[PDB]
Design a protein around this ligand. Structure first.
Ligand SMILES: [Mg+2]
Ligand SMILES: [Mg+2]
Ligand SMILES: [Mg+2]
Ligand SMILES: [Mg+2]
Ligand SMILES: [Mg+2]
Ligand SMILES: [Mg+2]
Ligand SMILES: [Mg+2]
Ligand SMILES: [Mg+2]
Ligand SMILES: [Mg+2]
Ligand SMILES: [Mg+2]
Ligand SMILES: [Mg+2]
Ligand SMILES: [Mg+2]
Ligand SMILES: [Mg+2]
Ligand SMILES: [Mg+2]
Ligand SMILES: [Mg+2]
Ligand SMILES: [Mg+2]
Ligand SMILES: [Mg+2]
Ligand SMILES: [Mg+2]
Ligand SMILES: [Mg+2]
Ligand SMILES: [Mg+2]
Ligand SMILES: [Mg+2]
Ligand SMILES: [Mg+2]
Ligand SMILES: [Mg+2]
Ligand SMILES: [Mg+2]
Ligand SMILES: [Mg+2]
Ligand SMILES: [Mg+2]
Ligand SMILES: [Mg+2]
Ligand SMILES: [Mg+2]
Ligand SMILES: [Zn+2]
Lengths: 152, 60, 50, 207
RNA sequence: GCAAGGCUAAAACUCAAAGGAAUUGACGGGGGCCCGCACAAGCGGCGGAGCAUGUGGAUUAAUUCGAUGCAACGCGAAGAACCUUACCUGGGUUUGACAUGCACAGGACGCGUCUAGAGAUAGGCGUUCCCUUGUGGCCUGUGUGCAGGUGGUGCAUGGCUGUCGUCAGCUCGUGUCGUGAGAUGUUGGGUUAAGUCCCGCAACGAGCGCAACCCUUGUCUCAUGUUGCCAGCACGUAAUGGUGGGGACUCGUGAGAGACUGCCGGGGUCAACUCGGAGGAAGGUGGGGAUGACGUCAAGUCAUCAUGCCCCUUAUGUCCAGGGCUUCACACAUGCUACAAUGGCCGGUACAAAGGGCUGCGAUGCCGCGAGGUUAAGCGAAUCCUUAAAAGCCGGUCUCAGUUCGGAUCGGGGUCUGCAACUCGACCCCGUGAAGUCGGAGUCGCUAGUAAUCGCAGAUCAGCAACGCUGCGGUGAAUACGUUCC
C-alpha cells in the first residue's frame, strides 16, 4: 500500500521435517482449509520421491528449488503509444514463491491419477532440471532477456 | 391497510385457518413479530420511543 | 429494516436481555414466608415463589 | 431523515422506559392496551400539553402517571373530567386503574412541550421564526439549558414550495451519548397541510 | 489599383441585451502533495449448462401495485391454497363488513335445520334485565347527517430511509479590509486516521465536526456455588458429576485494576509529533459494533402510518365462491448444483458456539429401508428436549470414464399441515438418469482468524426458508517491492 510495507506472517517448523520449506509447500497446496489433507499429499509425494531416489526428500527439494530458481521477471509498463516489457531483478523470497507456485500449478494439471504421485514426479523432474517448472523458468528467462534494451 | 380487512381479521372466521396476524398499531399483515404483535416499522418506532420493557438497541 | 420501503440494506438490531438470579433455598419458616408474601417488588422485576 | 432518536440512542444507558411491566405471554395484549390508551390520551386531551406518558402494570393492576403542564384542565371541575377519563380507562382496560398527575416543573425546558407550544402557535398562525425566537430565549432564561435546537419543516407559511429550516444556540452535541438531550416531536395543524416540529434540548452531560 | 483589393460609407429588419473589472463555486487530458482491493502480487467467482427468485417484453381474467444506474432487480414481500388480496368472472349488501347527533319503535342477540358455491335469506327456540311508566345500555326499518377508497397528486407533504459518506470538513460572534459581492480568520512550516496539535500571522474566540464517554471481545483481582464445576474425599449406581461433600478451578454476572505514547533512548523550534525499547492480554485508537456534519439527488415511500386539493357514494364502499398474484417464442440480475480421484460409496469414529421450546421441545419403546405415526416421562427451562455436529481420522471398493461425477426431467408408490395441495406446498421409496468435462470478449469480492470451505440456530409461518435474510462456530492460507499507470 501507500503507507509503507506490511510485515509477512511467520511460519512454524514441521516436527517431521524441521524446515520452513515443507510448511511453505503445504501452505501453497492448501485449498478449502484442509491443512491436514495438504500435509498428507505432500508427505505421500515426499515418501514416493524418497522411495524412488534414496536421498533425503528435503535435499531433493532443495536441489529442485535451486534448479528452478529464476533470476529476472518481465513486468510490463506502458508509456506512450505502445506497451513493452521491462526486465527487472527478483528478490530471493519472491523468486522462491514464484517457483513454488509454478511447480504446484504444473503438478495440478499433469496426466496422472492422484496428487501424491503427481507431486512426487513434479519434484523429481524439478530436481533433475527437466520438468514443466524448469521449462517455464527457461521461457521466462529468455523472453525477459529478449527485452534487455528497455531496462529503465 | 384497510379497516374493513382489519375488522374481517379481528372477527371470528369460518374455516379458522383463514385467520392471520397483523400489526397492533397500524394493521400491517406482514413483518408482525408474535412476541410483540406489531409490524416491523411500528416496532422500530416503538423501540426508538422506548415504550417496550426490555427492548433497546443492541451492540456487540 | 430502518427504511419503511425498499431499502433492505439499512437494518437496525435490538437486544432483549433478561436477568435471573436469587435461586436461594431459604427455609419455609412461617414468619419469613408471611413477610415475603406481604412485601411486593416493583413490576420491572417478576417474583416467582417455588 | 438521517439523525437517530436521541432517546433511543441513550436508551439502556441513561434514560428510562415510558411503560413498565413484566409479561412473557401477555406482551401482545399489554402492547395493544398501551397503544389504545395512548391513542385515547392523544385524542381529545391534546390541548393539555401531553409531554410524558408513563404506564405501569403491577400484578393485573394498571397504574397511569401522566405529566402535564396544567393539572387543572386534566382534573376538570374538581374531579369530573379526570373521573370520566378514568372511567373510560377502566372500560378500555377491564382492570383497576390508578391515574395520577404529579406535576410539570416548567413547560419551557421540556421537549414535546416546547414543541407543542410552537405547534399551537403555528396552528393559530403566528410567525414561525418569531415563535422560534421566543421559545429559544425562554429556554435560555431557563436555568439549566446549555443548548436548544428546534427544527421547522414544511410549507412554512402557506408557501407551495416546502422548506426545512432550523436555528440553534449553545451546544447540541448529538454525537455525545453521555450527554442528556430532551427530544420531542409534534406536528402543527395548518390550513395548507401541517408542519412537523422537532426539539433537542441539551441540559448538561450527566447527573 | 494590372489584379487582389484599399478608402469614404448606409438602410430596412431583428433583440433587450451585448460588454468591462472583481468574488464565490465548479470544471481541466494545468502545477504541488496525500489517500482508497483503487492500481499492482495472488486467492476464490460470474458471464458457458441445469435449478430457485426478482425484472423487461408477450399472452390472458388479473398476471393488483410501486420501485429503474452505481444508491431498483432473494427490493417493498421476516412465508401468495381461499384467507393475505388491494386483480378477473359471477352473485349478494348498500346510511353500509365499522364508530356517532337527530327524529320512531322494540328486540338486539346465542344454537341447529333445510335454500344457496358461501356470502345472504326463513321456517323452531330462550328473551325487552333495564321499573321501552320516565331517565339509562343495545339494535332492527324510513332515513337524515356520515362511514368508507390499496383512486390520484412524494413536483403540496410530515415522519422514516437510501446516496455522496464515517466524507473531515462546513460555519458563526466580535473586530479588521473593500462602494460592493466578498476576504481575514480557514494563510505559511512541521504533525495527525482526522480543521489532531505545535511555532508565526488582523486577527481574537466559538459551534456542527474528530477521538472520548455507550456496547462486545482480549489478562488478572474481589464476590458468588445453583440447575454449573470436581481440588483433597466418601459413593463407584451406569461410570451419563449419578449423590453427599468442597469454593480448590473454569464458568456464569456484579464491582475494579490494566493499555491512556504510562516510562526510557535518539530525533524533532526544546513544541506537536515521529521511530524503537522494558513491564505486559494487548502500543500507540488493543480489535470490532452503535455513533451518518452543513446539504444534495423536486431520490423513495399518498401502498407502515399520517396529511392539504380533486374524484364515486345502487359505487372507485363492502362481502362471498372459483381463478389469477406462480403464464412463456425470449433477455437481464442475484444465489445453488456440478463438470470429479483435494474425489464418490460402505463400516466405524472425536471435538462447538449461539439460539428455540404448554396451540410447544416429544427423553426413551414400538411400526415402517425410509420421511413419518403411536403411548408416554422430564422441561416456563445451566438440571428436559433440541443434541447426531459436518469438515477431521482409519480399512475396502471404484481407476480418469459423461464415470460408483452430475441430479434436471419423467413414470409409479407413500408421509406431514391445511375443510380442501391439478393450478396451489414440503418431505420420503423405486426406477428412468439431460446438459455439463472449467465457461468467449468481458466482469465480481477479498490483506488475518480475512478470503476459502463445512455445518448450526432465529424471524416470518398450520404447511411452504439445509438456493433468501440475520447471527453462530470449526479448519484455515499466499501476496503487499512500489503509487507511474485505470
Ligand atoms: Mg398464518
Ligand atoms: Mg470561480
Ligand atoms: Mg492487481
Ligand atoms: Mg461462472
Ligand atoms: Mg455463463
Ligand atoms: Mg413488475
Ligand atoms: Mg438480499
Ligand atoms: Mg377469497
Ligand atoms: Mg387471492
Ligand atoms: Mg385519498
Ligand atoms: Mg419526492
Ligand atoms: Mg478551505
Ligand atoms: Mg474563507
Ligand atoms: Mg476542530
Ligand atoms: Mg465519535
Ligand atoms: Mg420524485
Ligand atoms: Mg417514486
Ligand atoms: Mg399515506
Ligand atoms: Mg411475483
Ligand atoms: Mg438464492
Ligand atoms: Mg452419486
Ligand atoms: Mg459415513
Ligand atoms: Mg423403525
Ligand atoms: Mg476427465
Ligand atoms: Mg455432453
Ligand atoms: Mg448423473
Ligand atoms: Mg476465460
Ligand atoms: Mg420457520
Ligand atoms: Zn405497524
Amino acid at each position: 500500500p501507500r503507507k509503507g510495507p506490511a510485515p509477512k506472517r511467520p511460519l512454524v517448523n514441521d516436527p517431521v521435517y524441521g524446515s520452513q520449506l515443507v510448511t511453505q509447500l503445504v501452505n501453497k497446496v492448501l485449498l478449502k482449509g484442509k491443512k491436514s489433507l495438504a500435509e498428507r499429499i505432500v508427505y505421500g509425494a515426499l515418501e514416493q520421491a524418497r522411495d524412488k531416489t534414496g536421498t533425503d526428500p528435503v535435499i531433493t527439494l532443495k536441489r529442485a528449488l535451486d534448479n528452478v530458481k529464476p533470476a529476472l521477471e518481465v513486468r510490463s509498463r506502458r508509456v506512450g503509444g505502445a506497451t513493452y516489457q521491462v526486465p527487472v531483478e527478483v528478490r530471493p523470497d519472491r523468486s522462491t514463491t514464484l517457483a513454488l507456485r509454478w511447480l504446484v500449478g504444473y503438478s495440478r494439471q499433469r496426466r496422472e491419477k492422484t496428487m501424491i504421485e503427481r507431486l512426487a514426479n513434479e519434484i523429481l523432474d524439478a530436481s533433475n532440471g527437466l520438468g514443466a517448472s524448469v521449462k517455464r523458468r527457461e521461457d521466462t528467462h529468455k523472453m525477459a532477456e529478449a527485452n534487455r534494451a528497455f531496462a529503465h | 391497510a384497510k379497516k374493513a380487512l382489519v375488522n374481517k381479521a379481528a372477527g371470528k372466521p369460518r374455516f379458522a385457518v383463514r385467520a392471520y396476524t397483523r400489526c397492533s398499531k397500524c394493521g400491517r399483515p406482514r413483518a408482525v413479530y408474535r412476541k410483540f404483535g406489531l409490524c416491523r416499522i411500528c416496532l422500530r418506532e416503538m423501540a426508538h420511543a422506548g415504550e417496550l420493557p426490555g427492548v433497546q438497541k443492541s451492540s456487540w | 429494516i430502518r427504511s419503511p420501503h425498499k431499502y433492505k440494506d439499512s437494518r437496525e438490531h435490538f437486544e432483549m436481555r433478561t436477568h435471573k438470579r436469587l435461586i436461594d433455598i431459604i427455609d419455609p419458616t412461617p414468619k419469613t414466608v408471611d413477610a415475603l408474601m406481604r412485601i411486593d417488588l416493583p413490576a420491572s422485576v417478576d417474583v416467582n415463589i417455588q | 431523515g438521517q439523525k437517530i432518536n436521541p432517546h433511543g440512542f441513550r436508551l439502556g444507558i441513561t434514560t428510562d422506559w415510558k411503560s413498565r411491566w413484566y409479561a412473557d405471554k401477555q406482551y401482545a395484549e399489554y402492547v395493544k392496551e398501551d397503544v389504545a390508551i395512548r391513542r385515547l390520551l392523544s385524542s381529545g386531551l391534546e390541548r393539555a400539553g401531553i409531554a410524558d406518558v408513563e404506564i405501569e402494570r403491577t400484578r393485573d393492576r394498571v397504574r397511569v402517571d401522566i405529566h402535564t403542564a396544567r393539572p387543572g384542565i386534566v382534573i376538570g371541575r374538581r374531579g369530573t373530567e379526570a373521573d370520566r377519563i378514568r372511567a373510560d380507562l377502566e372500560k378500555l382496560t377491564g382492570k383497576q386503574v390508578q391515574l395520577n398527575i404529579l406535576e410539570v416543573k416548567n413547560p419551557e425546558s421540556q421537549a414535546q412541550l416546547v414543541a407543542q407550544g410552537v405547534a399551537e402557535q403555528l396552528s393559530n398562525r403566528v410567525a414561525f421564526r418569531r415563535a422560534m425566537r421566543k421559545a429559544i430565549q425562554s429556554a435560555m432564561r431557563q436555568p439549566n439549558v446549555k443548548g436548544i435546537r428546534v427544527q421547522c419543516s414544511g410549507r412554512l407559511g402557506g408557501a407551495e414550495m416546502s422548506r426545512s429550516e432550523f436555528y440553534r444556540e449553545g451546544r447540541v452535541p448529538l454525537h455525545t451519548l453521555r450527554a442528556d438531550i430532551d427530544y420531542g416531536l409534534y406536528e402543527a395543524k395548518t390550513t395548507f397541510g401541517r408542519i412537523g416540529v422537532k426539539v433537542w434540548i441539551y441540559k448538561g452531560d450527566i447527573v
